[model samples]
Target: YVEFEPSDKHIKEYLNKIQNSLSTEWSPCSVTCGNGIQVRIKPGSANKPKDELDYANDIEKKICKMEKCPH
Candidate 1:
């Protein structure tokens, strides 16, 4: 008899689970003063959900300012 295929419906459905969805929180500032870099790790996956957007969502970074640095 033939075995179950890898593209089984359940397999596809499982990937769509909320647990697999991209979830992340902004991490603490890298520094206390002056320009700082803050990062967030957006959970990503092979993501059967779609394409051209999953991998890039894995990480997000940007500048953060914590009160103008004292001179």
Candidate 2:
């Protein structure tokens, strides 16, 4: 897993990129992003896509309920 901070402008783009990558054949093994707002990335191989989405969503929801806002 990898984690890093991103500018507000790139947050959505980053997420889109990760999502798109997960949907592709050459996605990263794992990725996570955010400074104020946490976003997680979990790329799925051809065998499993739902797992990636579930992982990402779990992280997203968990962060959303955090004490501090990530934006």
Candidate 3:
């Protein structure tokens, strides 16, 4: 009989990769004036929900400021 099983090291490495992939830098805001919003995906936020009832929120947002463009 032949069987294959993942080792502890392999499992850790896989999880690490997933965590790294989820990491992201903040993005620039859409507006230059007033209320501007910046968005980014939180790191290590990957996971499989048990069902639709389960919540899987991973995105993050921040406020940004910039000089208004000259008319």
Candidate 4:
């Protein structure tokens, strides 16, 4: 699963850019006293930790699809 904490500017910019152009969705994530956002590119089944990355190759494929590599 990809995780991020973008600045408000970046978040708004991305939202506008993807609007009506992609079928993406997101949710608000709260941490103690603060709130952020999160997006799930791929859905997960109950008890399944997002997509099951069973091997290095599987991980590599997912990483390759991302436009920005924060890590």
Candidate 5:
């Protein structure tokens, strides 16, 4: 059973804590060359507490180009 402490009024603070606790590392470029993109975290932080970012909806899109494509 869950018990409510007198400190229960502080529940709002708890929501913010979970927001940034779902972070994961920046994903590498999609390709070795050409117009590839890198992906990273958003709405999360380096301070991830419990789980990895795979379950989260937040993401930061990034561009990358190791080299131009041969034509």
Candidate 6:
């Protein structure tokens, strides 16, 4: 994971850049069995603006599951 070190000024500036940005939609699960993973972007933090150091934290993940497969 990438780490960001934004100064006070930078935080303020970056916040403004994403103020009106829309969050990305969640992606489909990677699997269809007992467990799966889905991902999505943080609200207003999809494609971050220039001068931003890291967006690693922008990605979100969730565990998903479906009805058990019959045997």
Candidate 1 versus truth, CA RMSD in Å, comes to 16.9
lDDT of 4: 0.33
For TM-score, the strongest prediction is: 6
**lDDT tens readout by residue for model 2, 16-38:** 65664344333332233323334
For model 2, state the Cα shift of residue 12 in Å. Answer: 1.0
Model 3 lDDT tens row, 1-71 = 54343344443343344443433576555456654545445555534332311112565555566787667
lDDT of 6 at 63: 62
**lDDT string, candidate 4, 2-61, tens digits:** 555445455444434543432223433312233433433333322344344222222111
Candidate 2, number of clashes: 2
For candidate 1, give the lDDT of residue 22.
34
Of candidate 4, the 10-residue stretch with the lowest lDDT total is 56-65
Q: What TM-score does model 1 achieve against the real structure?
A: 0.43
The local lDDT score (0 to 100) that residue 69 gets in candidate 5 is 73
| Global Cα RMSD, each model | 16.9, 10.9, 17.1, 13.7, 17.3, 12.2
Top model number, lDDT: 6
What TM-score would each prediction reach against the true structure?
Answer: 0.43, 0.24, 0.43, 0.27, 0.42, 0.48
lDDT of each: 0.48, 0.41, 0.46, 0.33, 0.47, 0.53
For candidate 6, write residues 7-68 as lDDT tens digits: 34543444444534424776665456665545556766756754552445664556668667
Off by over 4 Å in 1: 1-23, 43-57
Q: In angstroms, how far off is 19's CA in candidate 2?
A: 1.1
| Candidate achieving higher lDDT, 3 or 6 | 6
Task: After the best TM-score superposition of candidate 6, give how far the Cα of residue 64 lies from its true spot, in angstroms.
Answer: 0.3
